[PDB]
Design a protein around this ligand. Sequence first.
Ligand code: HEM
Ligand SMILES: O=C(O)[C@H](Cc1ccccc1)NC(=O)[C@@H]1CCCN1C(=O)OCc1ccccc1
Ligand SMILES: N[C@H]1CCc2ccccc21
Length: 454
Amino acid sequence: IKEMPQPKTFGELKNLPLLNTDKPVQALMKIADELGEIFKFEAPGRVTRYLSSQRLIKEACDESRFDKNLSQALKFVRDFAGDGLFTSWTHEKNWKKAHNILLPSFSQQAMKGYHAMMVDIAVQLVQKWERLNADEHIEVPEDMTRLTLDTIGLCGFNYRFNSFYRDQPHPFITSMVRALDEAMNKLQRANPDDPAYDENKRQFQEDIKVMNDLVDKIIADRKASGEQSDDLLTHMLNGKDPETGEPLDDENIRYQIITFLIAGHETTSGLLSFALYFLVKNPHVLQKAAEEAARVLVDPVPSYKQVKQLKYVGMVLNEALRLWPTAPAFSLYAKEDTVLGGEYPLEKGDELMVLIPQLHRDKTIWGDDVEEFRPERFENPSAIPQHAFKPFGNGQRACIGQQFALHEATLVLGMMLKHFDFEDHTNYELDIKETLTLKPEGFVVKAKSKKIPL
Ligand code: HEM
Ligand SMILES: O=C(O)[C@H](Cc1ccccc1)NC(=O)[C@@H]1CCCN1C(=O)OCc1ccccc1
Ligand SMILES: N[C@H]1CCc2ccccc21
């Protein structure tokens, strides 16, 4: 039995002011580098423990011992994401119900159905870049966010956000981004009942209303038309849970669609942005990935089967997820009294945080070169130990979107590498912006067309 280290305290505020930063995950990573595989983190009326080693995380990922916790961030996002899949407890009836109904909608097999819609948005991205003038550059996270938001709108509910037709976001997106910023800003507030925050609260309720109003209208419009489009909204209006025999009600469907729109906007766009960053910083890797894209994507429109052959592009995406897992932390609670790692006794209900970027830098697993971008680490997936690599979380509460995100990201990165050469024309210095997710802020490149027709 060891005593856990704890970072610096602020009297009665304990560790809470360490999150008074726009980069809380990066702060926690630097604390992990100083303190090691486990540290205690305290706020008024809150204790959690941050885990960084595969040795401890492999136990935390034992579903017989630990279940998904809603962190303070997830409790605040639940105010507009409700009991959708991401912000539900495992024991809530609507978690297992929605999970059983939606799993077949998110399978590898289902990606054959979504492919044509993904190609539609991906071709819009390639056409935007083809149409740039010689003097112009690409705003990488901006364009990747235009893409991922449009892909989930179209595959989700046959709705065109038309992000490539706009400087300024759809009204839904303005409310969604402002609601997320408010949820994330609330974490570090030592005094949240302060009247300074009355404007925030009035605005928050207005953004929740806007989100509910468009999504409720889209569900109502689809029920009215009777149209049977092959999208997630159709699957949710028609689907029945084999266990309860019930369908999802319209309120839960609204929380699922809100959840899927946040995920598409926030997650896959980050992965693609980090992938392009690492490619332009590692020209040998860029060359190897571009040879594969040229050899495999022989048709003007990529096919589902062709995207599955992009093995090296998949390895690039996994190496980007290793260094900068886009959704970098998840929360667990002890189902019963238990001893973590033969050293740290926990009581039933005790919370753990998994610091995925730190897990991904465990030198006992990956070797001394952990900071280097080497997709070849992923050449043989069998060589990666259980629970060493967890960008999609864990067990039955793992990312339902994983096949969808990797299919979209592989298709789009394949087409980018086929159609363009890329220049890091500003020698961009990595600056990682944090919301729920990570993105490389201010990342810009120039693309030179290889002039291959669509
Ligand atoms: C690169 C992209 C993505 C990454 C890295 C990512 C990562 C994650 C992770 C780490 C979790 C677990 C959260 C936890 O334990 O608290 C999760 C859950 C989830 N993700 Fe993703 N995700 C991605 C894309 C998507 C997309 C595109 C969708 C949907 C369109 C999606 C939908 C979900 C849902 C619904 C959950 C909750 C699943 C459940 O608990 O039943 N994700 N994701
Ligand atoms: O929200 C939390 O409880 C903790 C931070 C915290 C706050 C108050 C006291 C003690 C700890 N959150 C986190 O450690 C991380 C970093 C910032 C947000 N966050 C988090 O888990 O966000 C939710 C999330 C994001 C992505 C995937 C799943 C869940
Ligand atoms: N994909 C998960 C991980 C990050 C995130 C944010 C919103 C909704 C779902 C999710």
